[PDB]
Design a protein around this motif. Structure first.
Motif, PDB file in Angstrom:
ATOM      1  N   UNK A 168     102.899 -17.963   9.689  1.00  0.00           N
ATOM      2  CA  UNK A 168     103.414 -19.224   9.194  1.00  0.00           C
ATOM      3  C   UNK A 168     104.222 -19.892  10.292  1.00  0.00           C
ATOM      4  N   UNK A 169     103.854 -21.127  10.596  1.00  0.00           N
ATOM      5  CA  UNK A 169     104.540 -21.882  11.634  1.00  0.00           C
ATOM      6  C   UNK A 169     105.306 -23.051  11.019  1.00  0.00           C
ATOM      7  N   UNK A 170     106.337 -23.495  11.712  1.00  0.00           N
ATOM      8  CA  UNK A 170     107.105 -24.674  11.329  1.00  0.00           C
ATOM      9  C   UNK A 170     106.949 -25.731  12.422  1.00  0.00           C
ATOM     10  N   UNK A 171     106.234 -26.814  12.119  1.00  0.00           N
ATOM     11  CA  UNK A 171     106.019 -27.871  13.097  1.00  0.00           C
ATOM     12  C   UNK A 171     107.044 -28.985  12.925  1.00  0.00           C
ATOM     13  N   UNK A 172     107.741 -29.342  13.990  1.00  0.00           N
ATOM     14  CA  UNK A 172     108.770 -30.353  14.019  1.00  0.00           C
ATOM     15  C   UNK A 172     108.283 -31.535  14.829  1.00  0.00           C
ATOM     16  N   UNK A 173     107.998 -32.642  14.159  1.00  0.00           N
ATOM     17  CA  UNK A 173     107.530 -33.857  14.807  1.00  0.00           C
ATOM     18  C   UNK A 173     108.683 -34.834  14.995  1.00  0.00           C
ATOM     19  N   UNK A 174     108.698 -35.526  16.125  1.00  0.00           N
ATOM     20  CA  UNK A 174     109.760 -36.476  16.451  1.00  0.00           C
ATOM     21  C   UNK A 174     109.408 -37.901  16.043  1.00  0.00           C
ATOM     22  N   UNK A 175     108.180 -38.345  16.263  1.00  0.00           N
ATOM     23  CA  UNK A 175     107.782 -39.710  15.939  1.00  0.00           C
ATOM     24  C   UNK A 175     106.551 -39.788  15.041  1.00  0.00           C
ATOM     25  N   UNK A 176     106.170 -41.015  14.687  1.00  0.00           N
ATOM     26  CA  UNK A 176     104.995 -41.286  13.874  1.00  0.00           C
ATOM     27  C   UNK A 176     103.707 -40.932  14.621  1.00  0.00           C
ATOM     28  N   UNK A 177     103.670 -41.145  15.917  1.00  0.00           N
ATOM     29  CA  UNK A 177     102.573 -40.858  16.802  1.00  0.00           C
ATOM     30  C   UNK A 177     102.155 -39.386  16.706  1.00  0.00           C
ATOM     31  N   UNK A 178     103.124 -38.501  16.578  1.00  0.00           N
ATOM     32  CA  UNK A 178     102.904 -37.085  16.420  1.00  0.00           C
ATOM     33  C   UNK A 178     102.490 -36.677  15.003  1.00  0.00           C
ATOM     34  N   UNK A 179     102.969 -37.430  13.990  1.00  0.00           N
ATOM     35  CA  UNK A 179     102.582 -37.191  12.609  1.00  0.00           C
ATOM     36  C   UNK A 179     101.063 -37.245  12.445  1.00  0.00           C
ATOM     37  N   UNK A 180     100.430 -38.222  13.074  1.00  0.00           N
ATOM     38  CA  UNK A 180      98.999 -38.424  13.084  1.00  0.00           C
ATOM     39  C   UNK A 180      98.329 -37.344  13.946  1.00  0.00           C
ATOM     40  N   UNK A 181      98.896 -37.105  15.115  1.00  0.00           N
ATOM     41  CA  UNK A 181      98.429 -36.130  16.071  1.00  0.00           C
ATOM     42  C   UNK A 181      98.238 -34.773  15.405  1.00  0.00           C
ATOM     43  N   UNK A 182      99.317 -34.259  14.819  1.00  0.00           N
ATOM     44  CA  UNK A 182      99.363 -32.920  14.244  1.00  0.00           C
ATOM     45  C   UNK A 182      98.482 -32.827  13.012  1.00  0.00           C
ATOM     46  N   UNK A 183      98.449 -33.889  12.230  1.00  0.00           N
ATOM     47  CA  UNK A 183      97.708 -33.962  10.983  1.00  0.00           C
ATOM     48  C   UNK A 183      96.213 -33.808  11.189  1.00  0.00           C
ATOM     49  N   UNK A 184      95.627 -34.566  12.092  1.00  0.00           N
ATOM     50  CA  UNK A 184      94.211 -34.517  12.414  1.00  0.00           C
ATOM     51  C   UNK A 184      93.837 -33.156  13.002  1.00  0.00           C
ATOM     52  N   UNK A 185      94.718 -32.616  13.855  1.00  0.00           N
ATOM     53  CA  UNK A 185      94.451 -31.339  14.505  1.00  0.00           C
ATOM     54  C   UNK A 185      94.331 -30.211  13.475  1.00  0.00           C
ATOM     55  N   UNK A 186      95.279 -30.167  12.553  1.00  0.00           N
ATOM     56  CA  UNK A 186      95.289 -29.207  11.468  1.00  0.00           C
ATOM     57  C   UNK A 186      93.991 -29.306  10.663  1.00  0.00           C
ATOM     58  N   UNK A 187      93.497 -30.530  10.462  1.00  0.00           N
ATOM     59  CA  UNK A 187      92.309 -30.771   9.674  1.00  0.00           C
ATOM     60  C   UNK A 187      91.028 -30.309  10.349  1.00  0.00           C
TER      61      UNK A 187
END
Ligand SMILES: [Zn+2]
Length: 409
Positions: free
Chosen positions: A9-28
Motif C-alpha cells: 500500500x502506497x501513499x501518493x502526495x500530489x502538489x498540483x492539479x497537473x499531477x492529479x491527472x498525471x497519477x490518475x491516468x498512470x494508475x488506470x
C-alpha cells in the motif's frame, strides 16, 4: 496461500492539479487498485502488486510525485482481520432472528434474518425479493411501514449498502437502521410518518467472494466479458444510467469497468426497478459506502443540480449530527460535490436516483477506523462495529426528517 502476498500500500502526495491527472491516468493504465484518489492537501492510497512495485515508484520518481510505503505486505493485515473477526464470532451471542453488533454477518445470515423479521413483525415489516444476482443468488430487501406502503402522502426513504462488496463496514450501518425501526423503536415519528426501503446486501456474489477469497474485491462476479474469463466483474457504481460511460474504464480488468451498457448487470437493474416503482414519492436516497468520512452529492461530472444549496445544507446537518457523537480518534465529516471533493465519476447510483426520483440523494463514505496495526482501509475492527451503526444512524434520521420536511416542494 493468498493473491496478496507481496502487495504493498502506497501513499501518493500530489502538489498540483497537473499531477492529479498525471497519477490518475498512470494508475488506470497499470490497472491498480485505487483506494482513495490523490488531491492537493489530502494524499491518496493505492494497492500495488509485487510485480509492479518497481515500475510504479519508478514513474513517480521521474515525475516528481511524492510517495511512500505504508504497508509492505498487506497479507499480514488481512490475516489479522480474520483473527480478530474469528474471535468476535466465537464470543458472539448473535442469532438467526437477532443479528448482534459485535461481528460481521455473511450474506446467508442477513438473508435468513430478513425473513425472520417478517414473521415476528408482519404489520410493519415486509420482506421482498427484488431479483437474482448474476450467479443466481436471491437479493431481498425490506419495506418498513405502519401503513403497508398504502398511504401515498407519506414520503419514502431508500437506503442501501454493500454495492462495493469489500466495504464491509457499510452493512452494520444499514443493519442498525433496521434495528431502530423494527427491534428497538425509541422514536415513533420515524416509523409513523415515513416509509422505508432498506437493501442490506446490494452485491451478494461479490460479498460472498470477499468472505472466502479475494478480500479486496469490489465488483460483481459477471463473466462473458473476456476470453477464458481472465478478467471478470463490473463496477456496479459505474453501471447506472446517469451519464454512463463518460467517466469510467473500458477494460474488464479494471476495477472501474462500466460494463456493456447502462444497467447491464442484474444487481444494478434490480435497484433501478425499486427506484422506479417508488419514484412518485421518494424523498431521500442513500448509497452507503466506505471509505472517507464524507457525504457527497451532485452529479459525478461536476455540474450542480438546481437544489444544490438545499442538498449541501441537509448534508451539513447530517454531518454535524455524526460529528457530535464520533470517536475522538476519528475525523470530522466532509460535505460537498462528488467531482469537487474526489474525482470525475459517472454511472453512480446516487446520481441516477437523483435524476429519476429523489430530490435529495447522497453517497455516504463511512469512516476508516484506525488501530494499533492498520490505518485507513477496508478492514474492520470488531470494536467499531456498533459505533459505526450508531454514529451513522444519527445522520440518517436527521436527514430523513429534514428531507421529508421538503413537502414544501
Ligand atoms: Zn464504494
Amino acid at each position: 496461500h493468498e493473491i496478496y502476498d507481496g502487495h504493498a500500500v502506497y501513499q501518493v502526495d500530489v502538489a498540483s492539479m497537473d499531477q492529479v491527472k498525471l497519477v490518475h491516468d498512470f494508475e488506470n493504465d497499470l490497472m491498480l487498485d485505487v483506494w482513495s484518489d490523490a488531491v492537493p492537501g489530502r494524499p491518496g492510497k493505492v494497492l500495488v502488486p509485487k510485480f509492479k512495485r518497481e515500475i510504479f515508484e519508478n514513474f513517480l520518481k521521474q515525475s516528481g510525485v511524492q510517495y511512500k510505503l505504508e504497508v509492505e505486505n498487506v497479507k499480514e493485515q488481512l490475516e489479522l482481520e480474520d483473527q480478530l473477526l474469528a474471535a468476535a464470532a466465537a464470543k458472539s451471542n448473535s442469532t438467526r432472528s437477532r443479528l448482534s453488533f459485535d461481528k460481521i454477518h455473511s450474506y446467508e445470515e442477513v438473508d435468513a434474518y430478513l425473513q425472520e423479521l417478517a414473521k415476528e413483525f408482519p404489520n410493519v415489516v415486509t420482506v421482498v425479493e427484488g431479483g437474482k444476482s448474476f450467479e443466481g443468488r436471491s437479493i431481498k430487501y425490506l419495506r418498513i411501514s405502519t401503513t403497508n406502503f398504502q398511504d401515498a402522502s407519506k414520503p419514502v426513504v431508500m437506503m442501501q449498502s454493500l454495492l462495493h462488496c469489500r466495504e464491509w463496514v457499510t452493512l452494520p450501518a444499514t443493519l442498525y437502521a433496521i434495528h431502530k425501526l423494527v427491534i428497538d423503536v425509541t422514536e415513533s415519528d420515524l416509523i409513523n410518518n415515513i416509509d422505508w426501503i432498506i437493501l442490506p446486501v446490494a452485491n451478494p456474489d461479490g460479498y460472498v467472494h470477499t468472505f472466502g477469497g479475494d478480500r479486496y474485491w469490489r465488483k460483481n462476479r459477471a463473466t462473458g466479458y473476456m476470453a477464458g474469463n481472465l478478467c471478470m466483474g463490473v463496477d456496479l457504481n459505474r453501471n447506472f444510467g446517469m451519464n454512463w460511460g463518460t467517466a469510467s474504464s473500458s477494460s474488464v480488468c479494471s476495477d472501474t469497468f462500466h460494463g456493456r451498457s447502462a444497467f447491464s448487470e442484474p444487481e444494478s437493474s434490480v435497484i433501478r426497478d425499486i427506484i422506479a416503482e417508488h419514484r412518485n414519492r421518494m424523498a431521500l436516497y442513500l448509497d452507503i459506502h466506505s471509505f472517507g468520512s464524507m457525504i457527497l452529492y451532485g452529479y459525478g461530472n461536476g455540474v450542480l443540480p438546481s437544489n444544490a444549496l438545499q442538498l449541501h445544507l441537509i448534508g451539513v446537518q447530517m454531518a454535524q449530527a455524526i460529528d457530535r457523537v464520533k470517536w475522538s480518534s476519528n475525523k470530522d465529516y466532509i460535505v460537498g460535490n462528488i467531482f469537487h471533493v474526489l474525482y470525475a465519476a459517472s454511472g453512480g447510483a446516487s446520481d441516477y436516483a437523483m435524476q429519476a426520483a429523489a430530490p435529495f440523494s447522497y453517497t455516504y463514505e463511512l469512516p476508516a477506523y484506525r488501530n494499533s496495526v492498520w490505518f485507513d482501509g477496508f478492514l474492520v475492527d470488531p470494536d467499531f462495529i456498533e459505533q459505526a451503526g450508531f454514529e451513522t444512524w444519527e445522520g440518517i434520521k436527521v436527514g430523513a426528517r429534514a428531507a421529508a420536511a421538503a413537502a414544501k416542494e
